């Protein structure tokens, strides 16, 4: 029978009110004999009607994929409210229900560090700048290499590896041509996260 | 039916002078009705028998996994010699051949960069010294913080991501108490790689 | 009857992978009645077939000299693996076997010191600079007077003479006309050795 997957909204969408966060319920392996899929949506057990079902799409295995989206309230998502998707399809023995909420775990304020390039790296054409974002939880975050609060041309961001502190860390590799760094630009790495003051922080960088 | 995968030697095997690299040919999904798998190995198309076929292994899907390995020489691997694995099995429609050599693409001498800790990082008890390794190609790499050209060890290593220069980069997160950085330790970092002098170069850092 | 000599590869060839190190088996005093010499080669007792026999050459004593060369692996030579040459000739009562490996003895990191010329030597046309390479063992080494890592015009290298520390030392006499030194050029003695990090170290020198 078909299977159902439920995706969270983008972190920024949950943190920026001028944005709309939504959860996405994806149903795969729906059969052609019974392609109709009913979606019912609930926020912490209360049915809401601002959810919408996306068009059904046939998959490589000759089954249908059916998706429903529920708009979620900023307050509901950031406070960790639970959003339930109910999926019904005749190729299912029982309706499938899936719940999602703000990515599980206690929020942690990201510690944003901007590691300068190696002194020996000035002999090379292009130097790397290194936004260490550590001590942040959940992975719902935005990490924002910048100059003086204005995002940068080129950063090659590592995965959220776990740091020496049990948080996620990543490096955003703000890789900059030698003149940019050597001249002492005030780069900055900003980071957007629920646990930050402003849900948004800015930690600068310059030849130092 | 069966599938064959041919793996290069471990990067440090190809890159550490003291090591002997070998290539490993893995065959999965060999059937039980015809479990016999023939491995023939070739170096630059010439069949060799210093290659060895590993034991057949039953997968949970009621198939067999069969593996053969061929030792490769430092200069041979680094000079791009081609090592070919020929796999035959009756559950295959035809024999499957795979060849492996130094990972194809322009080699680049790794630029080894003990990046200093962030000024912003001095607020914490511990700071990260990052041995950026950039400008290297292939990903066939080994990375190694150091001090005075001798190793350091609380380095994380990121993946060989792509760098802006069209190479791989990775960051080697040595992470250390703030005092070590502020005290002006002569750290270093080595990187072992085919394009390097002695395939191994070391770059130092200190405050 | 004939005699056999086995020579090691050049140190640099063993330390630079982009180089190929080889061992050379030399057979002298081979007779003219039986000039044919068979060479068999083994690496740590395992016969290899990437060895080659050089052309036979008649010596001053009216005997033949026959030579065989075996390419050696970087790993094999630097790890001290043993390479055996088997020599057969009818003018021999029994085959002659000779083994060679990385020059015998415990590796020691070369200490590279660049001694400036005498203060009184500026009164003379041309001053000497003194690359003291000490604490290095074995003699498999490359010693490299330079400027800033780029080899120099004129160093009169003094022998591997044993030092106060039981290593070989040598000077390399980077003799330089007075203006080069007096102006404070960053000369440099580098030194390549198995015991060095990178098998290769670089030391500056300047008027100091």
Author numbering:
A (entry chain B), C (entry chain D): 288 to 495
B (entry chain A): 288 to 494
The authors write:
IgG3 is unique among the IgG subclasses due to its extended hinge, allotypic diversity and enhanced effector functions, including highly efficient pathogen neutralisation and complement activation. In contrast, IgG3 contains a uniquely long hinge formed from a triple repeat of 15 amino acids that introduces 11 disulfide bonds and three O-linked glycosylation sites on each of the hinge polypeptides. Due to this long hinge, IgG3 is the most flexible subclass, with longer Fc-Fab and Fab-Fab distances than other subclasses.
However, in tomograms of IgG3 bound to antigenic liposomes, elevated platforms 22 ± 3.5 nm (SD, n = 100) above and parallel to the liposome surface were visible above the Fab domains. IgG3-Fc platforms are therefore an additional 11 nm further from the antigenic membrane than for IgG1, which is possible due to the long hinge of IgG3 adopting an extended conformation. These platforms were often observed above ordered, striated IgG3-Fab arrays; from a total of 1193 elevated platforms, 525 were above ordered, striated Fab domains, with the remainder above disordered density. To determine whether these platforms represented hexameric IgG3-Fc domains, we performed subtomogram averaging and 3D classification of all 1193 particles, which yielded a hexagonal Fc platform. This Fc geometry is in keeping with previous data of C1-bound IgG1 platforms, although these hexagonal Fc platforms have not been previously observed for non-mutated or antigen-bound antibodies in the absence of the C1 complex. Our data did not resolve the hinge regions and so, to yield a complete model of the IgG3 hexamers, we modelled the hinge as a semi-rigid helix which spanned the ~11 nm between the Fc-hexamer and Fab domains. The elevated platforms and divalent binding are therefore both enabled by the flexibility of IgG3-hinge region compared to IgG1. We observed that IgG3 formed Fc platforms ~22 nm ± 3.5 nm (SD, n = 100) above the liposome surface, with the hinge adopting an extended conformation. Our cryoEM model of hexameric IgG3 Fc platforms revealed the location of K326 on the periphery of the Fc domain, within the CH2 dimers.
